[PDB]
Amino acid sequence: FTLIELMIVIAIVGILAAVALPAYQDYTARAQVSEAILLAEGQKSAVTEYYLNH
Amino acid sequence: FTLIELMIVIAIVGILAAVALPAYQDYTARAQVSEAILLAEGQKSAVTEYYLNH
16 A cells, blocks of 8 residues: 555545645746736937926 | 265356456555545745735
8 A cells, every 4th residue: 555655646646636736827927918018118308208208 | 976076166166256346446546546645735935925925
């Protein structure tokens, strides 16, 4: 019944390859989001300039 | 007729070396199966990554 011990090791592996990964589709998003942040930044200038001029 | 007692001991040995082994071809299987479990595990990553990316 080391087999159990085995099947234990199996069992603990059994419920070890499921739901043990939080928030990574969450995390990639941030950067994937933040990528979008990277772009309109330059627009701020003429926006300011417009506000600056006007 | 200790011979009987003997042949008894024979007899009980007679039907003792047959069908007294359950489920071990069943058991090896599990690990033999579980061996197969051990492998595709790594595939889960890019699978996730694919799901993660996409």
